[PDB]
Amino acid sequence: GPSFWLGNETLKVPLALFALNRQRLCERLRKNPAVQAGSIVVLQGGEETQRYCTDTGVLFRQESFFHWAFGVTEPGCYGVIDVDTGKSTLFVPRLPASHATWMGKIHSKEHFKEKYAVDDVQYVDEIASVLTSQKPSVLLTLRGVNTDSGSVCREASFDGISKFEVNNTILHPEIVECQVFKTDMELEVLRYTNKISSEAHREVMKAVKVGMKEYELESLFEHYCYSRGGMRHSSYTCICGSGENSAVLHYGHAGAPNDRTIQNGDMCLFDMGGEYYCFASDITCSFPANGKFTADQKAVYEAVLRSSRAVMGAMKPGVWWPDMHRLADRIHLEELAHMGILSGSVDAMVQAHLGAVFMPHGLGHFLGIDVHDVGGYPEGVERIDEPGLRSLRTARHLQPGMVLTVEPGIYFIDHLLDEALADPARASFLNREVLQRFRGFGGVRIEEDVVVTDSGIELLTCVPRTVEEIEACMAGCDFTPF
Amino acid sequence: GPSFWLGNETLKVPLALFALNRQRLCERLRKNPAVQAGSIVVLQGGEETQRYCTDTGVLFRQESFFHWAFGVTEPGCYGVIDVDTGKSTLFVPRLPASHATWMGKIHSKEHFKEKYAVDDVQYVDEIASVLTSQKPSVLLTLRGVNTDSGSVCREASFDGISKFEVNNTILHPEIVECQVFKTDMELEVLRYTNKISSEAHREVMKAVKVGMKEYELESLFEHYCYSRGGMRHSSYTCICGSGENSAVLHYGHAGAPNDRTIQNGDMCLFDMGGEYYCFASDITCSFPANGKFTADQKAVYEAVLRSSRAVMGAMKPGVWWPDMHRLADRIHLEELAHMGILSGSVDAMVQAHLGAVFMPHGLGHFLGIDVHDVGGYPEGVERIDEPGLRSLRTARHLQPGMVLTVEPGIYFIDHLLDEALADPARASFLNREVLQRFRGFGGVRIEEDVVVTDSGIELLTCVPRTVEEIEACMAGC
Ligand SMILES: C[As](C)(=O)[O-]
Ligand SMILES: C[As](C)(=O)[O-]
Ligand SMILES: [Mn+2]
Ligand SMILES: [Mn+2]
Ligand SMILES: [Mn+2]
Numbered sequence: 001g002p003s004f005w006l007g008n009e010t011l012k013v014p015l016a017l018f019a020l021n022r023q024r025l026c027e028r029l030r031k032n033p034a035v036q037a038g039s040i041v042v043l044q045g046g047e048e049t050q051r052y053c054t055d056t057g058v059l060f061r062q063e064s065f066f067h068w069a070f071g072v073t074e075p076g077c078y079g080v081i082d083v084d085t086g087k088s089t090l091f092v093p094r095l096p097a098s099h100a101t102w103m104g105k106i107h108s109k110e111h112f113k114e115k116y117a118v119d120d121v122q123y124v125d126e127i128a129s130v131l132t133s134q135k136p137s138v139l140l141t142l143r144g145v146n147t148d149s150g151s152v153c154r155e156a157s158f159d160g161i162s163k164f165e166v167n168n169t170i171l172h173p174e175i176v177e178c179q180v181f182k183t184d185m186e187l188e189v190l191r192y193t194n195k196i197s198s199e200a201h202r203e204v205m206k207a208v209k210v211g212m213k214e215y216e217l218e219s220l221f222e223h224y225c226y227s228r229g230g231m232r233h234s235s236y237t238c239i240c241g242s243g244e245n246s247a248v249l250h251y252g253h254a255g256a257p258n259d260r261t262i263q264n265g266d267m268c269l270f271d272m273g274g275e276y277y278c279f280a281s282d283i284t285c286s287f288p289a290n291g292k293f294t295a296d297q298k299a300v301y302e303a304v305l306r307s308s309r310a311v312m313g314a315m316k317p318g319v320w321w322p323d324m325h326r327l328a329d330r331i332h333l334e335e336l337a338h339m340g341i342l343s344g345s346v347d348a349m350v351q352a353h354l355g356a357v358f359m360p361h362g363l364g365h366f367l368g369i370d371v372h373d374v375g376g377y378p379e380g381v382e383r384i385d386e387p388g389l390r391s392l393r394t395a396r397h398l399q400p401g402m403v404l405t406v407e408p409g410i411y412f413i414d415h416l417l418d419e420a421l422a423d424p425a426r427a428s429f430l431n432r433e434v435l436q437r438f439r440g441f442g443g444v445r446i447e448e449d450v451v452v453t454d455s456g457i458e459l460l461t462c463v464p465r466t467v468e469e470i471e472a473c474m475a476g477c478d479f480t481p482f
Numbered sequence: 483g484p485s486f487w488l489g490n491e492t493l494k495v496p497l498a499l500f501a502l503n504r505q506r507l508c509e510r511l512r513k514n515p516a517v518q519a520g521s522i523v524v525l526q527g528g529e530e531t532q533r534y535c536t537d538t539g540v541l542f543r544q545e546s547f548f549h550w551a552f553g554v555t556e557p558g559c560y561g562v563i564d565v566d567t568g569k570s571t572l573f574v575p576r577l578p579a580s581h582a583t584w585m586g587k588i589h590s591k592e593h594f595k596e597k598y599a600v601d602d603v604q605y606v607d608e609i610a611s612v613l614t615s616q617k618p619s620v621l622l623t624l625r626g627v628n629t630d631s632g633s634v635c636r637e638a639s640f641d642g643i644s645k646f647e648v649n650n651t652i653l654h655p656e657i658v659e660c661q662v663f664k665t666d667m668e669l670e671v672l673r674y675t676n677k678i679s680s681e682a683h684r685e686v687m688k689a690v691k692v693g694m695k696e697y698e699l700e701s702l703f704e705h706y707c708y709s710r711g712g713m714r715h716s717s718y719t720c721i722c723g724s725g726e727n728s729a730v731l732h733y734g735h736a737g738a739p740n741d742r743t744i745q746n747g748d749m750c751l752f753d754m755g756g757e758y759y760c761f762a763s764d765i766t767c768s769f770p771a772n773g774k775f776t777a778d779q780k781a782v783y784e785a786v787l788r789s790s791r792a793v794m795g796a797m798k799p800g801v802w803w804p805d806m807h808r809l810a811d812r813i814h815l816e817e818l819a820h821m822g823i824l825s826g827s828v829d830a831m832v833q834a835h836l837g838a839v840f841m842p843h844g845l846g847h848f849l850g851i852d853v854h855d856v857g858g859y860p861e862g863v864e865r866i867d868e869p870g871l872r873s874l875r876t877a878r879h880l881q882p883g884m885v886l887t888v889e890p891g892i893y894f895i896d897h898l899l900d901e902a903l904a905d906p907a908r909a910s911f912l913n914r915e916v917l918q919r920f921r922g923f924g925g926v927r928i929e930e931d932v933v934v935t936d937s938g939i940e941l942l943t944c945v946p947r948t949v950e951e952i953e954a955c956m957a958g959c
């Protein structure tokens with residue numbers, strides 16, 4: 001069948017990927033006791049937008065649930081699926097013929113049917129008539145809460161939907177649960193997004209020079225990803241933190257826009273991932289700006305490398321993800337003590353939640369069409385009310401087919417360190433005479449993307465990771481993964 | 483005073499630019515007899531957004547009116563101006579301690595006062611209290627219709643605004659009219675955006691090779707603009723049309739995403755412009771993919787070069803922009819007749835609106851903070867209901883300080899050509915046997931950015947334009 005492709009060496013993605021997702025969704029719904037015969041899933045695609053009240057178009061990127069189900073790149077569509085038969089119908093906007101003045105040939109319905117390999121294509125304004133003719137029992141629409149953003153996903157609506165029976169509770173948890181488990185076709189795309197983004201990270205490590213602005217590397221990364229990878233979007237705004245900015249976790253946004261000059265002796269923490277056909281990648285490389293780790297930089301870096309590799313080596317089906325977070329915490333504390341920053345009993349440090357002072361974020365998160373992918377906290381899965389752990393984006397147990405980031409880090413964040421030093425339950429573990437040397441260090445994060453498999457994991461990311469590999473890459477060189 | 487700067491060779495933009503805009507706005511409002519003493523302009527800045535219901539942040543770019551007045555890059559702000567005194571107050575979000583962990587330094591109010599050179603800084607949650615203590619007669623908020631998008635600009639709101647007298651009609655036409663006329667400080671930024679984007683267009687022309695995808699040049703353009711110019715944003719989605727796609731005016735968007743392979747013999751029409759600190763550029767270069775114009779390509783291209791330079795040579799204060807559009811139409815028709823595509827009386831071709839078959843869009847538009855800048859159709863200025871002219875984004879007369887694109891083009895658009903051939907009043911001019919050779923040619927657009935001066939214009943753009951210059955540029959090592 002047909003494939004999405006941006007030519008050159010970019011990945012051909014079969015539209016069969018999306019057909020398989022529709023089939024899987026129907027198979028799940030058919031087993032659901034709340035679902036009756038004759039139901040139709042109704043999804044609404046994203047619409048074209050402009051900046052504020054201007055006529056400046058914003059580049060359209062499809063809504064993620066719609067993309068998962070249909071793979072459609074055009075704005076203004078709807079899509080329905082007959083649950084009992086699996087039959088799919090795509091609804092596309094009716095453009096008047098005069099639009100050919102500005103748009104060139106206006107594609108036929110048949111063009112879109114062939115392009116997307118759906119069973120039928122209709123115009124959007126006909127959706128009430130078309131659904132009416134099917135005499136559905138119920139329309140299943142999408143409404144639920146994203147557990148990272150807190151936002152409510154808005155259900156499809158069209159003129160005349162009030163004439164139907166509509167259910168907006170059944171679908172969301174079910175399509176989310178399908179999305180949590182990636183098909184082999186989806187894994188091919190995620191292998192690709194990791195390949196390109198890994199190459200781009202290596203080009204950035206080769207190119208970085210003392211005296212450059214952080215954004216010069218943002219630009220270079222995105223240029224590699226688009227020109228060589230066909231990745232028109234990034235999966236999230238690039239975080240290019242140098243020096244003390246490497247301790248700011250979501251650095252790079254409009255308020256702190258990658259605008260610092262990189263200085264000799266700085267650490268860099270570059271968290272960047274290109275997006276291909278609305279599939280994510282999410283990779284963090286940490287390295288010395290000048291290509292040579294100092295002793296202190298090597299020690300912090302290798303502490304995070306140790307936790308990264310320990311977690312990757314322990315991950316397998318049945319593992320409780322919060323236990324991996326606690327494992328990383330224990331390793332960071334052990335290694336910070338081995339560096340002389342901390343002293344005393346590590347068991348006691350853990351009891352005092354000291355790990356969260358140095359890693360205030362979750363160990364990692366589901367990844368897929370969204371960088372923070374859906375499904376981390378389905379009904380019944382609770383957030384753990386402790387520092388660090390409460391920021392985990394899932395408390396699930398691992399199962400084959402899940403895609404996770406593994407992103408431990410250690411950071412020197414002044415207000416968290418000062419809180420600890422003010423707290424008698426924590427202050428005694430800290431050695432100010434050594435810690436003072438790490439004030440303003442920034443931080444290190446080592447972030448890999450992995451697939452849970454029957455036997456463990458599959459590592460998707462392919463970047464230099466040991467001190468020796470990184471120094472070689474920065475000197476321009478050719479490295480072995482976990 | 484302070485300046486915005488992204489280091490390296492990027493432009494230092496004095497924050498005095500925005501202070502001058504505030505002053506100019508107050509000066510215009512003070513002259514409006516409907517404006518009450520004690521009025522306060524209240525603007526609301528843009529807020530951070532995410533993709534749909536995801537927690538995927540969208541990179542924040544400031545709302546254009548707010549930017550014009552304040553130059554503020556942070557989301558979640560408000561800004562007010564006392565009309566009678568000119569005094570400015572910026573309202574910034576009061577951030578929680580955790581912002582220090584995830585987003586960065588929690589800057590003090592004094593930091594922002596110094597950064598933006600405003601008279602006072604307060605927190606957003608204090609705006610009702612602060613405005614109350616000033617005892618304004620009326621709050622002037624911003625509501626009006628953009629004449630390109632048709633969208634209604636949404637006025638500021640805050641908790642407690644219902645307790646004030648609010649007017650939402652006076653401000654919009656007044657701030658728009660100020661934006662129409664660029665200050666010398668604004669012109670320095672538009673010279674810079676044109677400089678970087680012109681350099682980037684030159685690099686793209688040197689880099690194009692048969693066999694590349696269109697989007698490889700989009701990528702290169704934006705990388706040049708960001709890494710060398712500090713332009714994190716483009717002014718609009720890059721249009722990288724090759725072959726017949728150069729006839730598709732609305733090309734490059736998500737439905738037609740610069741994904742065609744450039745072939746030997748194609749024309750390229752690349753319309754790209756970086757944005758610096760929310761100031762636009764808007765440039766189109768047209769050229770043969772393989773670096774050498776064929777005879778037909780030279781003829782079409784030189785026709786558009788002729789109208790481009792005739793229009794620029796005629797532009798000066800008092801000139802009616804629709805007359806310039808008609809000038810370009812007439813020249814295109816003349817050249818298309820010289821080429822043998824047309825025959826007969828050009829006067830009669832003009833009477834039959836034949837020019838619009840080949841150039842269906844407007845000759846050019848105001849440019850500033852937005853690529854299609856505000857103020858093209860203020861009250862009393864009407865849209866002309868004729869082909870071509872109805873797509874003009876302004877029907878105003880030119881005055882010093884206006885910034886315009888000059889962007890004539892000729893395209894071979896099947897829908898329009900077929901229509902013209904069906905109409906006996908137009909078909910008699912069209913030589914079907916010659917036109918057939920140009921089906922699938924695509925099109926040519928030559929787009930310059932210019933400033934109206936007291937005596938004529940200043941050209942901002944600097945790219946190769948003659949056939950000889952373009953071929954030389956593309957052959958450069
Ligand atoms: C800062 As992230 C995209 O690894 O959650
Ligand atoms: C296609 As345009 C931004 O020049 O109007
Ligand atoms: Mn990341
Ligand atoms: Mn991540
Ligand atoms: Mn343009």
Ligand SMILES: [Mn+2]
Pocket residue numbers: 764846847887889929
């Ligand atoms: Mn333009």
